[PDB]
Task: inverse folding
């Protein structure tokens, strides 16, 4: 699971992805500064239990909308980077995308 | 000031803009659901007093970064649309911009 066969390559960040575009939830947890269990996160935030085969058989999965809704539910340092990124994209889309 | 000579055309929304890319702060207030004075907003949120000629002589101005930092400082309905938009752009930039 360290040589994922599909990745969403966003910055220097490289998240593993299912053929239908769900993210590898472990990796999501690293990028959002969670240390709680994925079962705990799912319960706390009203997220669906989903799994996808990321090349290592089924593992927990999170949709991109939901990864985002979490980044803005958390207050970790890491989730704040994600949030700041969301704000910068809004700024750039308003300057003409440039 | 209803036929602004430069507009940032974002959605159906059309904000007036200075030659150096500042937004018309009145219009910013409408779009962010403020009814307080622009002097009050400037004080409350730690914004600079700026003015630009938007075709009607100098009027208060707000930078795009600052319009954004406010949309995420407010909790109005309108500022929430702006925020939701910031989240959608993050989602799309992660799906490849598509």
Result:
């Amino acid at each position: 699971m360290k040589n994922a066969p599909l990745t969403l390559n966003f910055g220097s960040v490289r998240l593993p992805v299912s053929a239908d575009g769900l993210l590898h939830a472990p990796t999501a947890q690293q990028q959002l500064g969670l240390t709680q269990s994925w079962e705990a996160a799912l319960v706390e935030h009203g997220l669906p239990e989903t799994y996808r085969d990321f090349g290592a058989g089924p593992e927990a999965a999170v949709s991109v909308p939901d990864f985002v809704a979490l980044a803005f539910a958390l207050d970790t340092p890491e989730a704040r980077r994600w949030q700041k990124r969301a704000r910068e994209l809004l700024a750039r889309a308003m300057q003409g995308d440039v």
The two ends of chain B are 36 Å apart (CA to CA). Residues 88 and 94 of chain B are 10 Å apart (CA to CA). Chain B has one domain: 7-94.
